[PDB]
Structure formats: C-alpha cells, structure tokens
Swiss-Prot record:
Gene (name only): LYZ
UniProt function note: Lysozymes have primarily a bacteriolytic function; those in tissues and body fluids are associated with the monocyte-macrophage system and enhance the activity of immunoagents. Has bacteriolytic activity against M.luteus.
SUPFAM superfamilies: Lysozyme-like
Protein name: Lysozyme C
Enzyme type, top EC level: hydrolase
Residues in C-type lysozyme domain copies: 1-129
Protein's organism: Gallus gallus
GO molecular function: beta-N-acetylglucosaminidase activity; identical protein binding; lysozyme activity
Residues annotated to bind substrate: 101
Length: 129
C-alpha cells in the first residue's frame, strides 16, 4: 500500500507514535517519506547482505528474520515479511524498540540526513488529526 501523507500521519498517531520518546509526529512522517516514499512493500539490499524492509526500512541484521542474513539477531521477534503489510502495526511496534535503544531516531540514516534540524511539522500541516 502507498499511503497518503495525512493518511499515514493519522495511522501513526493512532498507534502511539506522536511524541514517542520525544519525537513529534512530523519526524516519523518525514522519515517514512525518505526511507520508503510511503510504500509498505519497499525493500532494499545492503552491502553487508542484510535487507531493509517496509515503510520504515527496518534491517534484518538486528531486528527481523528473513532466513538469509547469517549471524543476524531477530530483536523484534518477527519475520521481515510482516513489515511489508498494509497494516503498519508490526512496523510501528518494532520502530518503538529501535528508537528506545539509545541512539533515538539517528538509527535511521535518512532521518538524520534529511529530516533532523528541518521544519518537520510541515509534514503534518493541513492534516485533520
Ligand atoms: Cl511535528
Ligand atoms: Cl541519506
Ligand atoms: Na492523505
Ligand atoms: Na535477522
């Protein structure tokens, strides 16, 4: 599923991401825009052999099991394919574990390089929330 901007904001808010660990909703929508272009089916392979999955591009070396990342952990205890669903519940619950691990949203390279320090509230402007 390819989400609309305000559609995704509303979905993330209902799942408890607004201000989670201090990150306003605009941060999560900006991260999804540049990680996946709001497409839940997005996948990208990394140089080390791991793969990134879903709307928030969660990586198989630490967070999910895809059966082809040797020596990986499965810290969200989920198959990576569950992160591609049109229902974002599994992606959100895993993102909450990631963002609590110590480095905040800097775990997402695109947030650091394209959202951090910008006017992120613009990503929710005009939405009925
Ligand atoms: Cl915001
Ligand atoms: Cl980047
Ligand atoms: Na929308
Ligand atoms: Na893994």
């Amino acid at each position: 599923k390819v989400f609309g901007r305000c559609e995704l904001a509303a979905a993330m808010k209902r799942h408890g991401l607004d201000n989670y660990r201090g990150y306003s909703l605009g941060n999560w929508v900006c991260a999804a825009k540049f990680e996946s272009n709001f497409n839940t089916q997005a996948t990208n392979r990394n140089t080390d052999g791991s793969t990134d999955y879903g709307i928030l591009q969660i990586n198989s070396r630490w967070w999910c099991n895809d059966g082809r990342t040797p020596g990986s952990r499965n810290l969200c205890n989920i198959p990576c394919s569950a992160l591609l669903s049109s229902d974002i519940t599994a992606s959100v619950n895993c993102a909450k574990k990631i963002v609590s691990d110590g480095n905040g949203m800097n775990a997402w390279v695109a947030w650091r390089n394209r959202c951090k320090g910008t006017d992120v509230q613009a990503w929710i402007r005009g939405c009925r929330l």
